[PDB]
């Protein structure tokens with residue numbers, strides 16, 4: 001916990017030039033069109049444009065620790081708004097173009113964006129979510145649960161139980177939730193397209209799940225400013241700001257990015273909406 005390996009921190013950013021970027025986002029559009037089963041994998045990089053610093057980027061929580069500096073928040077977790085990328089992923093699921101979303105983010109923002117919980121794996125837990133130790137019932141709070149490390153928050157269960165409520169934030173030693181990880185693994189293995197968004201993929205087993213798509217001929221796309229662990233294994237790497245890549249993709253796919261209504265919780269995916277007809281590819 002003092003000595004916990006924090007991986008490689010503050011590696012240089014790569015920026016694809018605009019023509020190369022435009023050409024790579026079109027090829028990402030082509031792979032989404034061809035894919036039966038698209039799984040998205042998200043890391044702290046999708047929440048940097050909403051004021052929340054990442055871990056290993058130039059101004060990351062671990063990077064600044066290594067240099068004896070403090071990370072800088074431009075928001076509270078509570079006042080944080082989902083990004084363009086968060087709202088793009090909401091819409092891609094609604095029109096049936098995303099099968100499953102796996103996130104390492106504890107920032108609560110996929111849930112607040114209105115993303116269906118039944119298509120989300122929160123591998124490292126959720127700051128707004130507490131769980132009953134007895135009935136395993138989860139509560140999505142409008143404020144951050146004040147503890148970390150699967151501790152007692154001080155509230156009791158209201159299930160028609162008085163079970164002790166605990167946070168969902170894994171400590172370094174704590175293994176991933178069996179339900180979320182099993183569902184993340186399954187969706188990853190069965191995917192023909194895995195797209196990683198603002199993750200450096202350095203955490204096991206979180207960062208290895210996109211590799212499971214590569215078995216039986218699936219395609220891997222990494223979108224990230226820095227190198228990631230699995231750059232070698234990727235069919236397509238896109239070095240740009242994830243908001244720019246996702247707005248450009250959504251425009252190629254015929255899809256508008258929807259308004260955020262403010263914080264809302266959807267437990268179960270609604271029936272799919274109409275989507276644009278597919279272009280002729282080959």
Ligand SMILES: Nc1ncnc2c1ncn2[C@@H]1O[C@H](COP(=O)(O)OP(=O)(O)OC[C@H]2O[C@H](O)[C@H](O)[C@@H]2O)[C@@H](O)[C@H]1O
Pocket residue numbers: 042043044045046048049054055056057060104105106124197198199200201202203223224225226227240241242243
């Ligand atoms: N706007 C942006 N657009 C694209 N990429 C970005 C952007 N901003 C940052 N990045 C990139 O996004 C990447 C973010 O990678 P990391 O910072 O390792 O976060 P994780 O989600 O992988 O951390 C996993 C766990 O490790 C921790 O201990 C916690 O337990 C976490 O849950 C960087 O390479 C940035 O270059």
Ligand SMILES: Nc1ccc(S(=O)(=O)N2CCN(Cc3ccc(-c4ccccc4F)s3)CC2)cc1S(N)(=O)=O
Pocket residue numbers: 043044047052053054055061104105106107108124127148169170171172203
């Ligand atoms: N970007 C960022 C920066 C800070 C926070 S946080 O202040 O809410 N807080 C959260 C817990 N960590 C400590 C950890 C303890 C155990 C860890 C761990 C669990 C499993 C597998 C590997 C692991 F390393 S990490 C400190 C920051 C949140 C984010 S966000 N947008 O949610 O990703």
Ligand SMILES: [Cl-]
Pocket residue numbers: none
């Ligand atoms: Cl904090």
Ligand SMILES: [Cl-]
Pocket residue numbers: 094270271272273
């Ligand atoms: Cl819908």
Ligand SMILES: [Zn+2]
Pocket residue numbers: 132133134135136137157158159161162163
């Ligand atoms: Zn209970």
